[PDB]
Design a protein around this ligand. Structure first.
Ligand SMILES: *[C@H](CS(=O)(=O)c1ccccc1)[C@H](CCc1ccccc1)NC(=O)[C@H](Cc1ccccc1)NC(=O)N1CCOCC1
Length: 215
């Protein structure tokens, strides 16, 4: 594994989004991972549709919550592997509205075939990230609620309750850190991102790391 990687610099990460007043973090985590896997496979970066998941994934609960594992399963087993573009199916649940599922002639932005789980092992996660692109992860978000910048070192690490996107790390820092894309707009945190220390399982970040498989 290299000393640092930042997939934003490598072209695999779309702008920061805003889930709004909807518990759809799990959909943003899933979609962010697919956006990265699709780009790393050699396709142009394209923003994909969280709304598709919020409205159409019948395993998960829309704004009531969900799991990235379920969302990847729904895409593959119920939507033919297809993921619609954000342009085709824009996000409208930010004020809590939850319209019926559309499905119908939507532009297909990406396709996946499966998903994989990573071990609860920060070194293995870093190596896989560096080779393969941004990863869906779960965290305890308790300490995110009052984040105002810098690197967390004493994150509350009690119970997973939020899905986010792991986009990089930097070991050449006191302390080493992960770089995480949140879905609370670009006004939150460090332009929508948070850094947490790497190597002390901050916020339970190692516990539920996954990635879609393209091709
Ligand atoms: C998204 C997290 S958040 O940013 O909205 C948030 C909210 C409150 C505290 C901390 C973070 C989402 C919020 C769900 C919600 C809905 C209404 C009111 C309050 C909270 N969280 C989830 O969807 C979590 C994500 C998760 C992913 C992977 C592992 C563990 C958790 N999942 C979740 O709540 N469930 C999935 C399983 O079934 C029931 C609930």
């Amino acid at each position: 594994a290299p000393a640092a990687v930042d997939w934003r610099e490598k072209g695999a990460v779309t702008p920061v989004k805003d889930q709004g007043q909807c518990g759809s973090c799990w959909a943003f985590s899933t979609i962010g991972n697919i956006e990265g896997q699709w780009q790393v496979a050699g396709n142009p970066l394209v923003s994909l549709s969280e709304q598709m998941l919020v409205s159409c994934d019948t395993i998960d609960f829309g704004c009531g919550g969900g799991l990235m594992d379920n969302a990847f399963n729904w895409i593959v087993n119920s939507n033919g592997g297809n993921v619609f573009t954000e342009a085709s199916y824009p996000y409208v649940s930010g004020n809590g509205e939850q319209p019926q599922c559309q499905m119908n002639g939507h532009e297909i932005g990406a396709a996946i075939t499966d998903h994989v789980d990573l071990p609860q092992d920060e070194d293995a996660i870093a190596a896989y990230l560096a080779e393969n692109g941004p990863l869906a992860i779960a965290v305890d978000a308790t300490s995110f609620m009052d984040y105002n910048g810098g690197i967390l070192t004493s994150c509350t690490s009690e119970q997973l309750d939020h899905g986010v996107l792991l986009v990089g790390y930097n070991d050449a820092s006191n302390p080493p850190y992960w770089i995480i894309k949140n879905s609370w707009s670009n006004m939150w945190g460090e332009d929508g991102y948070i850094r947490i220390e790497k190597g002390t399982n901050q916020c339970l970040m190692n516990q539920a790391v996954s990635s879609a498989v393209v091709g």
